[PDB]
Symmetry: C6
Subunit: 215 residues, 6 copies
């Protein structure tokens, strides 16, 4: 990473990433952990992290297709200019330079370090996180429409399932807000559903959980 001078990615950081992928597969929390293990990383470092994954190769191919798309959008949105690079400047970074394919570690340290800086590590990380989100959507087992409280399921476990499935869903904040605003009370079991309908449309989750607590 870069912290300002450049460090190598640590054996502990990399190892941590590997163990995360092995254990948690592609659960949502994988992405923050990644974003934490990859904080201040260069495209070489990120490439190292993705490469360290054995197995899960289908997902990885999806991810590099996403990276390809974002790199091409970068290229069309940033047309390269022809001409000799001045002494005090650096060349213009292509989409492949953001993904670490056609760029050296010194060039990455250059763009991140030299002034008027381009944060290629954070741009590449953004693309990677896009692909990862698409993957978590891909491998999510459930859909929020199918989370229904059981007749003998305590309210709390039903809310755990509900907001896990909701974390996994592909929707804007307004659509998720609508799903909370509608399905949670709608798809509780008859008893808790009557209690919550008696609370009103403006009660907080704390009040709803305390209300259906003994139930």
């Amino acid at each position: 990473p870069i912290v300002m001078v450049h460090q190598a990615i640590s054996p502990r950081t990399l190892n941590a990433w590997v163990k995360v992928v092995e254990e948690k597969a592609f659960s949502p929390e994988v992405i923050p952990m990644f974003s934490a293990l990859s904080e201040g990383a260069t495209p070489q470092d990120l490439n190292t992290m993705l490469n360290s994954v054995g197995g899960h190769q289908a997902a990885m191919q999806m991810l590099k297709e996403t990276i390809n798309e974002e790199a091409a959008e970068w290229d069309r949105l940033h047309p390269v200019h022809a001409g000799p690079i001045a002494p005090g400047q650096m060349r213009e970074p292509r989409g492949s330079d953001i993904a670490g394919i056609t760029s050296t570690l010194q060039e990455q340290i250059g763009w991140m370090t030299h002034n008027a800086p381009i944060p290629v590590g954070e741009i590449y990380k953004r693309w990677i996180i896009l692909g990862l989100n698409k993957i978590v959507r891909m491998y999510s087992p459930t859909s929020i429409l199918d989370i229904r409280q059981g007749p003998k399921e305590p309210f709390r476990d039903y809310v755990d399932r509900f907001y896990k499935t909701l974390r996994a869903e592909q929707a804007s904040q307004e659509v998720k807000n609508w799903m909370t605003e509608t399905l949670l009370v709608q798809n509780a079991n008859p008893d808790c559903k009557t209690i919550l309908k008696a609370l009103g449309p403006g009660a907080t989750l704390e009040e709803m959980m305390t209300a259906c607590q003994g139930v």
Copy 2:
């Protein structure tokens, strides 16, 4: 975190937090450990810590509702002023800027680092700890009124149960002082209760435990 320059949150700190949540669920000691693992953290770091939790999603939703309330109270209590930000200054932080939603890492490092500083990491941490306290109250099994010494329970185990349940209770220092002042002696078993009533209302816990030791 920030220690003055900015570090990334370490794989060991994050991993420690994750293991704490897995093992201890939402016991009181979770909150100090958090406050220790999150010492000097940015809202991005705190967001990373909360995001790293798989499962327990109901509690997390409660927590972000708490964060929403505290952010809105901040917003009404700090009305934003319209006008162009001067060169030597920074913009005014909204409630969403405290929670890391609408603010960049460089803006957080700005408010914490630049002089006349606003400790947004400690404010956000305060809100988070508020929500966590509400959660520990939520998931506490017992109430202090129900801790009664058993006929064959040694005094020490009864005091362990009593002050654990008392740690979990939602009450001011004066109400807790009253609970110690009344229920502990009141709800001991008849033998120890007679001994402690013989000691008087001004004896220390050391003297009470030494008195009912052989009992």
Copy 3:
């Protein structure tokens, strides 16, 4: 801690403390380990360490009663003066300021860092260690008067038991010196007791253990 600038307490230091309390309960060695894990700590750090303990709540209540007593003795022994604090100075620390209750981390770093310094971390640590000693006395199973060598117990195991129980006892160096000077030889089994009585009152433990070695 503070090492001069202020660090946060590490996940490894805290975790180590927690494991010590879990495994060794309240054995004497707990207190040095504490004093080692808490070296150069602030009252916030010490509070974090005590708070990280789940269970053992009776002992913790005893400990905060001890802290209360030492804080009140500090308060009566250091009467606060009324008047406006000058620019180049800091306020006077109360007993509650030593225990981290009514003081900020910056105020603690102030008293420890600013010149004419008050080591509030070492004072608070002294109070805590007082309470811990009282606890180790509380939970010690044995009394030094009851350590008697068995008929078939090797001398070395008897000395191990003897000086463990002696480590746990509440007595000045002169009283412990008397206990060594009397009970160790007095309460050995008849054979070793006759050997040691034949050595004389001025022989060292090395000579006593070598004498009763084959026995």
Copy 4:
């Protein structure tokens, strides 16, 4: 390594390398991990890493034959000049000097540190990674022509196998692009093969996996 001054390779880095070779044998991910554990390494450090491997001696001999070839190509491509080395300069590095055989640690730190620098650590690492790639090709069990989807195999597992075997293959990006462009759809089972043939030759892997998802 060198980070600018020279460090020793850490017990944790070396140990990590050893464990990687023990567990993962010669899977592709071994090479990135190596390239990560060996970041900024000297030829002495790399030699230490290769030497720390017990067993797998056939592969190691293959690797030092590769290193020999690359060193001889370096030697013929860089003919050494006869004459006394000036005070302000260093000698010219042979192929054996790149591999750490005939060069001291101070000479390596010289070439990497002194200006007009020669990155002998990265050149040697390049040769080593060449040999490692040849080894991974050697020990790969399968060939991409033999990955055929089973009648009851979900599409995702078939893509995992396919792009693992494809990661192990020895082919340029254009040949791999052709293999993706042809065999993946060609060698799916009849059902998924008909679905994918119905999608068209321009569909992305995400669309193909979503299409054959329920299948």
Copy 5:
């Protein structure tokens, strides 16, 4: 420790020491490990290390008796002078000041740090290592006179036993040299004894082990 400014002893160093005592008891290698974990330590640090030992209290009492003797020899050999300590100087350290009993951490950092320095940490460590050697002698099971090669024992195992027991013995280099010079060949089994007697009195251990290898 002190490395120049003062560090606290690390949780890892202390924990390592504890585990060493638990596992290896009082084997010779305990003393180097100690001397390595205690490198550059203050008497407070060393006291922490000895205090962290639970159990083995007989040995510890022997050790503090040794420390007492060495402190008294220091006191008689360094008579304290009466008079007011000058501003630019420090007081004279007693034997109890070397053992950390009657001296503050700042006074130890003073003697070790301030010029014309007294290395009280290395003196105290010397005394401690004296006591530890006396303990290893105490708990050694065997005597070098009793190591005799078995009729079917390979020569190498007999030499392992011999030089382990010889490591544990209390003797000068000349007495140990005599023991090697005599007993090793003398107390081998008849076959190897005849071979070694045929080699001569000037053969090295390598030659002796190669000679009795097949035997």
Copy 6:
């Protein structure tokens, strides 16, 4: 070690060394690991590492005999000069000063640090590695003349055995080159032996292993 100022050897480095000796006994890879854990070490550090080994005492005695020989060769090759050491200089190091016997840590830091420097740590390490090589030769079970491919042994396992045994052999690069040049093809089983004899005397190990792959 020394990295320029002097560090203590770490608990992790030492512990790593101990575990290496426990697990791998005296396999070849022990020596690089040593040379890596001992990088930049002082004779005190190296002495600590050798001392930390429990058991294996025969080998250790062989090693200190080797160290004695190399020290005596140093002494005869470096005759000490009589006369008072000038202020700006240091004394001349004996062979015993290289091995840490008759020299202080400050004298070692002097020779390594002060200019016109003598690297006594690397000289002592050279002697130690000499003894270690002699030991690995001592405890090697096999001889390269006895590695013969089995009738049903795959070629790769036979090459693993062959170059392991070859790593353990005591021979110059030319003798090892002859052993590769002759015995490997000579001592394969009849089938692979005929294939390899058909390849020719100039084929690489890669080609030989690919040739006898299916066999």
